[model samples]
Target: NYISTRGAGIGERHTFSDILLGGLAKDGGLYLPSEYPQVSADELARWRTLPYADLAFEILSKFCDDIAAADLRAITRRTYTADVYRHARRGGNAADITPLTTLGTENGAPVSLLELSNGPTLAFKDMAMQLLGNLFEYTLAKHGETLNILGATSGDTGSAAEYAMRGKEGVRVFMLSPHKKMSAFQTAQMYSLQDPNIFNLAVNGVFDDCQDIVKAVSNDHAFKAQQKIGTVNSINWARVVAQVVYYFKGYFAATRSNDERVSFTVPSGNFGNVCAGHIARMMGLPIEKLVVATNENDVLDEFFRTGAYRVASNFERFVFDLLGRDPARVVQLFRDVEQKGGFDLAASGDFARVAEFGFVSGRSTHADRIATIRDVFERYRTMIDTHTADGLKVAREHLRPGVPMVVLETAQPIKFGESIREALGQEPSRPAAFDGLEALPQRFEVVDANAQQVKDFIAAHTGA
Candidate 1:
């Protein structure tokens, strides 16, 4: 259920290398349990009828044997309570808020869509961040340590993470995004907040730059010890672990836990969301294929098509022309993994491997992405945002004639309001929390793309 690092000690001073390689170490490392936990089909069948809390407890307990079952159940209940469960009714306290539904014809080459933007921030990140925020608070208190979280978001993550960690005790979160890259609403969601513990920085460089700086700072042993820095990005194991729940939930819901094979297409960037599908497949879930969907930033698609992973030094140019800013460093980090064989977090990092993973990848051209949005609205009587359109595009191609395929709708189309409006001739509305953002004055510091500068900033602000 769990794996150990390739080079570091069992549970002490989690090295940057351990974190970078998706729990694998940098020295040709691998993270694997001495033995795999077996899930009996009978028990898994019973899980189909259990509540979300019970399901989470059963699945997580199998992997997290270090934590007591009763305590983990308590943590799950406490972490998924009302303050964060935006959709829970005044008295109804179910934790599964996002809905999973089938799109396209079920009998005519079936493809499903997993809608993930029903939460407050209206992005897929909320699915895990809401739980992670509470988990951090609970674990930090149990361990008697305060945590300072450093994160870099492209658009939705900062707002989602800030909202989750806003008023929690013993936690302070600092989020950095490219200065002008996020949508108006995305920027407003971060800047308009006045919480004492949340800090927003508009760095001068791209999202990759901000992400690198955060990794550099977190890797500094002295700095991390000084501030107790933790991460909220998918780099955090909990983020990916939290996402694994939905894959199971979605699969069981669609097939009533009877199907032995299912497929998923994810609108992927930074590779975390789709990576969850890979994890699900690894965990003995009956996954057929994982189709990775990408926007105009087609590095992942190219990698899948050619078995060659390359990172262009100036990758932000791909986003700047369309969105007017860059919000994509996680993409770069995955590219680092593809190129460098394993993973690396240092300044001198470069690609070092040629092994092919099993997932399929496809690209959505800017025109193709926009056209799909317009076509879906015109034909299906439903509107899909840009990211979902990317997944739908790829999903249309690989859906087996009779097998089920699920495409993850990662964010609300309204997040890309301007693009949607221009493409489909309708004005997208902003969330109430982000209304009147254009009228608010912007406030953020601009820092160069240097790791030392970022370290200095964290040191001056949080003494880290």
Candidate 2:
């Protein structure tokens, strides 16, 4: 009954009915919840005192009624312990998980920023993927089954997913990205993994092509048992479920009362992060607005400005030269959901519609993206990655006078060292563990954009 929509391609049908069911249907659709849950004022009052794990439990419990509170708490605690957050023994040297800091003055107004690049990986994907990986592990072990996770990242998700699943028992990961489209750091992050359980592929086409292949494989019923496939991208509901916590945390931190209102400026690509903010608003977070920020690829921005969605000429150009694969595919997915009125898991195979949704496009010049990064830093004493800078720009333009606004910093500035150095005249230092990664011997395979190729690649290694 909690099912959202069916898979669009390959005649596959889906519902929240198959969440624990695992993998995409042969017909090609993503599974989403039919309804959104709300956060009560009592919960808001308790936000500051609640541990991250407890906050996660309270938020997630509403979506997953089947999971017991005790088990969920244990899982959250295990997933986000001090060892993972700030350990001296383990290589835990990133900023604190979910650091709330001020980015700088916007329109002469101070803007709050949520720094999410504090995990093993220096991207926001770590915020969700870390917890999701733990959930996959717990669920797999509980059910006595192995999990084969398939994800396509434009940039950050692959590395974050790989980091979470590496060396875990009964878990294998396959990540795909457009060949040579990602930044050196982003590519190295995905390609340099030493884990035997992780498989990274640089696809011949765009990020959309890579995502198409993954969806196709998931929808193939014959391949389901053959691969035990699951997803780790925002396409999976778990990512959204995990992401909703920060909206509540940040909102309560900014305003201790539910009656007070606040707004969010989100640096968005796939629309998953901003969509999470929308979901939070739907859950009664008292959000005044969700200012959608974009780099050169402006698909979501156009959607917010005008309901009509159209594709750009050679969407691949945007991917190849501009924002890289992550934002490109993410923006496309946002268009997909908007065109469909919501998510239609059954429509996963409707490549044409997916492509049409692709048409609902927007563009930001490379020069504009860089200038915004520089402008935000100059105004705010805050350095942001390109994506986050886009959000800051949009937030400054749209935020009402005197209202508190928080912009989600999705990744560390160091992740975009080249762009940062070019725009700001300096590069932020990387964590010691990340230092010298450029010299590491990178290992990965180049693969064709075929579901069978992906399946075969996984099969040859792990029999998933």
Candidate 3:
């Protein structure tokens, strides 16, 4: 059973399938586990011995308890395989599904890169979206209902979701991306798709503006219900649950002991990926620090640094349980920020509690990203994408001795080829499918970032 993070129906709960179908709750809050599930040292040790698919089953079962065991097992097996992630350049082992590559030292500790973008889209979003495609189809078939997924992506999520749900029955994908913010390759990968079920809307704004439209549309109860609007973004709990599997995998690959702990420095975008790490830590994984590394646009980094939460008031919900799990307190905190320009927990004891939870953050600039990209390429002969360069830059800043630091690689070099070529003096490797993407005729609508405009397009396309 799951409850809304914003507090809903007292103790009222819903099944995993229900959450999968509806994405966000009717109350406009994300669905979360009724209680944080824990994994003991003994249990963690046992799980470390299992293979990726088997281990994923154990963890996903705790959350997706309503789904049939046989079906879930089949889904896991189908979603993860050597054939699926064959493009993985490095792994902890050659046979490993996701490899960890060491790119020199950060401080006294070894700074490693956990390769996550090996799927069809060459981005980490595929790690979860592939599983979501199966889940959506399974759940939809059970009730004989169709879902129109309205998703927001900064970069990789759009292609990953489009590729996953392209030909699935009873599922239509309406992906929204920033008109000119994404790389050219990323734009072509999605906008060039000929699939009738996929619709790309290039909104003329930043990724935040695109996401605002998604939230606004979802909040319109009549529109969301009538159009059967669902989401495939991090807003969907199913995406986060699928992502948690890799944290355990990375922990096992980085260290030999349950007694030993490691740290993960994630390149932050929507905060979805790092949120998965937070949940894994709560589940009793021995993580030292979930360091959030942000690029030039870093409102989250500032919030963690100064306690001045600017971008999102709902961030209080992140550590809400730590503040006595009082729903009223969390609600009032958000309200205070809404009425006032900002709120501060800097001088408060709750602010101190944040440090105790082992959450730290830092920001990176464009120069930092460039230098780190060249540094890793020269030393390890590895060409990384721009977003990953952001993580490595900050991962070096906060490395601890003897405790390995694994920075999650967000995407492959092909997508951000221009940045890679500028960093290095050569072109990046590309898939045959993307040979002449820049020359391809792209098909996507250019629109303003308005909720009603997006709703009208969706309603017309979905025939609502």
Per candidate, the number of residue pairs that clash is 8, 30, 3
lDDT of all predictions: 0.65, 0.66, 0.79
For this target, which candidate reaches the highest lDDT against the unseen true structure? 3
lDDT of 2 by residue, 285-318 (tens): 7777666666555555544444334532122222
Report lDDT (Cα) of residue 210, candidate 1: 84
Instruction: Pick out the ten consecutive residues of candidate 3 with the lowest summed lDDT.
Output: 310-319
| Of candidates 3 and 2, the better by lDDT | 3
For model 3, the local distance difference test gives 0.79
Model 1 Cα RMSD, Å?
A: 8.1
Q: Report the C-alpha lDDT of model 1 over 1-464, residue by residue, as the tens digit.
A: 33232233345444322342132233323333333345677877777776666776776666566656798788666655434545321122335554566666744666766766666677788878877777677666766766788889887888889988988877888787898888877887788777878878788889898888887886687987787777665435566666777787777766755555777888855456655665566566777777777667655656455544444211222111112121234344445667765333223222211112236767888789889888877876666788888888888878677677888867776677866887878876444654676678765667777777766766677644
Q: What is the full ranking by TM-score, best candidate first? A: 3, 2, 1
Off by over 4 Å in 3: 91-95, 178-181, 202-216, 310-317, 431-434, 437-460
lDDT of 2: 0.66
Residue-by-residue lDDT tens digits, candidate 3, 351-446 = 766677677887888888889889878888888988898888887888888888999988888877878878998889654755787778888988
User: CA lDDT of 335 in candidate 1?
Assistant: 51
Give candidate 2 misplaced runs (Cα > 4 Å).
6-30, 82-96, 104-109, 178-181, 202-209, 296-298, 310-368, 446-453
Off by over 4 Å in 1: 1-36, 81-95, 295-298, 310-358, 430-464
The model with the greater TM-score, 2 or 3, is 3
